[model samples]
Target: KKKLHFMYVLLLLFVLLFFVGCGVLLSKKK
Candidate 1:
């Protein structure tokens, strides 16, 4: 399951970066 674990971590980091970018854009609108 090592491959699965690595993919999960990568996905989590990707999602976190996506949300953070969106948040920055929204905040700039305020």
Candidate 2:
């Protein structure tokens, strides 16, 4: 259903955003 699909995609996007934030923070420390 649309509700399930939307939640799945949103979760994936949030994980991606979190990953990018961590990577940027790591670079800052280098």
Candidate 3:
């Protein structure tokens, strides 16, 4: 699980960054 877990979370972070930057729209809330 070690190798798979690392790659999985890395990919998830990459995806999350893409979405979180969508915050320009969502950031308007703040």
Candidate 4:
């Protein structure tokens, strides 16, 4: 149960970073 929780939080952070990165690139292009 503890291991599962850790993976879930890591995945969430990865996705959040991915979106934020994309947004920064788009803004710079514009």
Candidate 5:
């Protein structure tokens, strides 16, 4: 259970980073 919780946290961070990265790229293109 602890390991699964850790994985979920990691995934949430990854998704947040992914969106941030995309936002930066889009802004740069404009």
Candidate 6:
């Protein structure tokens, strides 16, 4: 159970990081 919880947290953080990176690239284009 604890391992599952950690996996979920890492996935969420990775998703957040991806979106943030995309946002920065978009702003640079404009």
Q: Give the candidate number with the greatest TM-score.
A: 1
lDDT of 4 by residue, 1-30 (tens): 999999898899899999999999999978
Give the winner by lDDT: 1 or 5.
1
Q: List the candidates' TM-scores in order.
A: 0.62, 0.58, 0.39, 0.60, 0.59, 0.59
Weakest 10 consecutive residues of candidate 6 by summed lDDT: 5-14
lDDT of 2 by residue, 1-30 (tens): 999998898899789999998999999978
Give Cα-based local distance difference scores for all models.
0.90, 0.91, 0.84, 0.92, 0.90, 0.91
Clashes of each: 0, 0, 1, 0, 0, 0
Task: Give candidate 3's error at residue 4 in angstroms.
Answer: 0.6
Error of 1 at 21 (Å): 0.6
What is candidate 5's local distance difference test score? 0.90
TM-score of 6: 0.59
True-vs-predicted CA distance for residue 8, candidate 1, Å: 2.1
TM-score, prediction 4:
0.60
- Candidate 4, 28: how far from true, in Å? 0.6
Clashes (candidate 3): 1
Number of the top lDDT candidate: 4
Q: Which pairs of residues have clashing backbones in candidate 3?
A: 23-27
Candidate 1 yields a Cα-based lDDT of 0.90
Ranked by lDDT, the better of candidates 2 and 6 is 6
Question: TM-score of model 1 relative to the true fold?
Answer: 0.62
Cα deviation of 9, candidate 6, in Å: 2.7
Tens-digit per-residue lDDT, 1-30, candidate 1: 899999888899889899999999989978
Model 1 root-mean-square deviation: 1.2
lDDT of 4 at 22: 92
Clashing pairs in 2: none
Per-candidate Cα RMSD to the true structure, in Å, reads 1.2, 1.5, 3.0, 1.5, 1.5, 1.4
| Candidates by TM-score, descending order | 1, 4, 6, 5, 2, 3
